[PDB]
Amino acid sequence: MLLIFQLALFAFIVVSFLLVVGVPVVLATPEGWAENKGTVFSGIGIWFLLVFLVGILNSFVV
C-alpha cells in the first residue's frame, strides 16, 4: 500500500497546487465565481476526499 499511499499523497499535493492558484484567479475574475463556481466545488470536493483517503491510508502504512 506504500505505493498507493504515496500516489494519493502526490495527487493531494497536485490538486492543492491547482486550488492554490485556481481559486484566487476565478474568485478575482468577475464571471469566475458565477460560471466556474461549479468546477471549483469539484476541486474542493476532490481535495477533501483525498484528505480523508490519505488519512485512512496513513493507518495501514505507518
Binding site: 463556481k37 466545488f41 488519512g55 485512512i56 496513513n58 493507518s59 495501514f60 505507518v62
Partner: protein, 257 residues
C-alpha cells in the same frame, strides 16, 4: 387565554416560521455558494425542513415529494425511537444496571435458547419479563401488523385516548396520513397553528439526526464490534487513542522518533 406560551417570561414566545418556511427558508448551502434560483422548483418551502436539498433530482413532482415525505417521516420517527432505544439500555448496563442483552445488535441472541429479557422501568423497579421468544415474535408481529394496517387503511377500531376521552371510528376520518393528531396528541400541543408548524420542523430535524445516527450505530457495530455506548465512552476516555484511525491501524504502531 392560550394553551401555548413562551419559555423565558412574558413576550418570550417568538416563533419565526420564515427561517423554516417560505422564500427565505434556510438552505443546505449558504447564500454565497447556492443561489435560491438553483433550488429544485418542486421544493417551494411548504414542507417542514425544506432545506432545498435534493441532488439527483429524486423528487420531480408534488405527488412524488408527498409519497417520499410519507417515507421520510416514518423512517425518521422509527429512527428516533431506535436511536434512543438502542443506546439507553446499554448505558444502563455499563453503569451497573442488570440488563441482559445491552448492546442493540445482541438483544436478539439473548432471547434464543429460551432466554428472556429484563425490561427496566428505569425510574423504578425492573422486571423479569416472562414472555418467551416464540410469544414475543407472535405478539409483536400481531400488534405491529394490526397497527400498520390501520395506518394503511386510514381507519381503526373505536377506543380510548386521554386527550379525546372515548372516541369512535368517526375520528379516524379527516386525519392526516402523516400528522393524525386527535388521539395521537393527548397533550394537545398541536392546537396553535404557528407552534405546530415550528414543532413539525423540530420533528424531522431530530428525526433526520436520528436516522444518520443509527446509520453510524450500524456501521460502527460492523467495524468496532462494540455497542454505541462503548464507542462513545472510550472516545471520551481517550479521544486520540480510541477513534476510527486507531482501530483501522490494528497494530502496535512503531515509535517514529
Amino acid at each position: 387565554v392560550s394553551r401555548s406560551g413562551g419559555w423565558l417570561g412574558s413576550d418570550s414566545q417568538n416563533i419565526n416560521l420564515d427561517k423554516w418556511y417560505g422564500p427565505d427558508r434556510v438552505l443546505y448551502l449558504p447564500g454565497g455558494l447556492l443561489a435560491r434560483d438553483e433550488i429544485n422548483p418542486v421544493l417551494n418551502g411548504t414542507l417542514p425542513g425544506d432545506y432545498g436539498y435534493d441532488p439527483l433530482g429524486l423528487a420531480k413532482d408534488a405527488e412524488t415529494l408527498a409519497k417520499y415525505r410519507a417515507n421520510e417521516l416514518l423512517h425518521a420517527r422509527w429512527a428516533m425511537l431506535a436511536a434512543a432505544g438502542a443506546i439507553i439500555p446499554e448505558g444502563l448496563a455499563a453503569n451497573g444496571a442488570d440488563v441482559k442483552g445491552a448492546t442493540w445488535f445482541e438483544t436478539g441472541a439473548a432471547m434464543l435458547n429460551g432466554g428472556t429479557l429484563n425490561w427496566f422501568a428505569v425510574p423504578f423497579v425492573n422486571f423479569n419479563n416472562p414472555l418467551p421468544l416464540f410469544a414475543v415474535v407472535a405478539i409483536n408481529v400481531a400488534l405491529m401488523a394490526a397497527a400498520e394496517n390501520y395506518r394503511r387503511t386510514e381507519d381503526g377500531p373505536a377506543g380510548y385516548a386521554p386527550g379525546v376521552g372515548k372516541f369512535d371510528e368517526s375520528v379516524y376520518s379527516n386525519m392526516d396520513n402523516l400528522y393524525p393528531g386527535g388521539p395521537f396528541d393527548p397533550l394537545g400541543l398541536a392546537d396553535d397553528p404557528e407552534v405546530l408548524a415550528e414543532l413539525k420542523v423540530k420533528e424531522i430535524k431530530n428525526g433526520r439526526l436520528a436516522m444518520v445516527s443509527f446509520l453510524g450505530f450500524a456501521v460502527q457495530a460492523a467495524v468496532t464490534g462494540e455497542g454505541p455506548y462503548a464507542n462513545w465512552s472510550k472516545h471520551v476516555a481517550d479521544p486520540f487513542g480510541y477513534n476510527l484511525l486507531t482501530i483501522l491501524s490494528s497494530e502496535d504502531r512503531a515509535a517514529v522518533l
